[PDB]
A paper describes a structure:
Among type II receptors, TGFβR2 and AMHR2 only interact functionally with a select number of GFs, whereas ACVR2A, ACVR2B, and BMPR2 are promiscuous and can form signaling and nonsignaling complexes with an overlapping group of over 30 GFs, including homodimeric and heterodimeric activins, inhibins, bone morphogenetic proteins (BMPs), growth and differentiation factors (GDFs), Nodal, and Lefty. At the most basic level, TGF-β pathways are activated when a dimeric GF forms a signaling complex with both receptor types, triggering a phosphorylation cascade from receptors to R-SMADs that results in R-SMAD–mediated transcriptional responses. Structural and biochemical studies have revealed that the GF-binding domain (GBD) of both type I and type II receptors adopt a similar, “three-finger toxin fold”, where the “fingers” refer to three pairs of antiparallel β-strands that form an extended β-sheet. We have solved the crystal structures of the type II BMPR2 GBD in complex with activin B and of the type II activin Receptor ACVR2A in complex with activin A. We show that BMPR2 and activin type II receptors interact with GFs using a nearly identical mode of binding.
To determine how BMPR2 and its GBD variants interact with GFs, we solved the crystal structure of BMPR2-GBD in complex with activin B, a GF that can bind BMPR2 (28, 35) and that signals via BMPR2 in some cell types. We solved the BMPR2 complex by placing the activin B protomer structure predicted by AlphaFold first. The asymmetric unit of the BMPR2 complex comprised three receptor and three GF protomers, where all biological dimers were related by crystallographic symmetry. BMPR2 binds activin B at its “knuckle epitope”, a convex surface on the GF that is formed by a set of antiparallel β-strands or “fingers”. BMPR2 adopts the three-finger toxin fold seen in other TGF-β family receptors with minor variations in β-strand length, flexibility, and orientation. Its GF-binding interface is similar to that of ACVR2A and consists of a concave surface that harbors a hydrophobic hot spot containing three conserved aromatic residues, Y67, W85, and F115, at its center. By contrast, BMPR2 exhibited significant variability in loop regions and in areas that were not directly involved contacting the GF, possibly reflecting the intermediate-binding affinity of BMPR2 for activin B and the conformational plasticity of the GF-free BMPR2 structures. In fact, loop conformations in the GF-free structure would preclude GF binding, supporting the idea that these loops adopt distinct conformations in the GF-free and GF-bound forms. We also observed a second, substantial interface, which results in the formation of a GF hexamer. Notably, type I receptors interact with the wrist helix at the GF dimer interface and this feature is occluded in the hexameric activin B complex.
Numbering used by the authors:
A (entry chain E): 31 to 41, 53 to 71, 75 to 102, 108 to 133
B (entry chain A): 293 to 339, 344 to 407
Write the structure that this text describes.
């Protein structure tokens, strides 16, 4: 089990979550970039997406930023680092 | 269980990516962009312990004489399924995350 950041305005006392065994952390942000959702991402079976030490972001609005990462609470900040 | 390598035609698990981009669903599903749903393909035996070996002799005798016995062959089917996390739009434009079960085939086997 892993502890992840949590936030859900759709229907966090201290901001922790017990994930089922084998799950990871995720986070979704939306203009002026504020958070929409955080929690447990139990989608393994596609390690092209959830193999990260920290939260990494890679028709869509183009405004949304989704990540998943492996460690505790890593879904609090993301980063983009593409080579030019 | 067998993994499909493209060589054997035995009951195996073939990797299959479902792209929400190709089916035009990336507008209401935010994440994932797609997933390896996979599927089962390949051949299986005719479908025990000691009595099933007796049926073996009956089948072989009927086939030997040009008759046809119970051609109840087995089927290549998923034996192990995993759940998948999905992040998508709700019908009222609210953001709903739901872990949809039985989405990814992880092993195949004969029925």
């Amino acid at each position: 089990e892993r502890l992840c950041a949590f936030k859900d305005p759709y229907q966090h006392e201290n901001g922790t979550i017990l994930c089922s065994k084998g799950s990871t952390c995720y986070g979704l942000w939306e203009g002026d970039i504020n958070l929409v959702k955080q929690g447990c991402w139990s989608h393994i079976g596609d390690p092209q997406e959830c193999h990260y030490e920290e939260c990494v972001v890679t028709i869509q609005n183009g405004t949304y930023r989704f990540c998943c990462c492996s460690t505790d609470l890593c879904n609090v900040n993301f980063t983009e680092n593409f080579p030019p | 269980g067998l993994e499909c390598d493209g060589r054997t035609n035995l009951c195996c698990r073939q990797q299959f990516f479902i792209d929400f981009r190709l089916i035009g669903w990336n507008d209401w599903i935010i994440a994932p962009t797609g997933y390896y749903g996979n599927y089962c393909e390949g051949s299986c035996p005719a479908y025990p312990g000691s009595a099933s070996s007796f049926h073996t002799a009956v089948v072989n005798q009927y086939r030997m004489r040009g008759l046809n016995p119970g051609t109840v062959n087995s089927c290549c089917i998923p034996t192990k399924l995993s759940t998948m996390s999905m992040l998508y739009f709700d019908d009222e434009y609210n953001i709903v995350k739901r872990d949809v079960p039985n989405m990814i085939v992880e092993e195949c086997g004969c029925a």
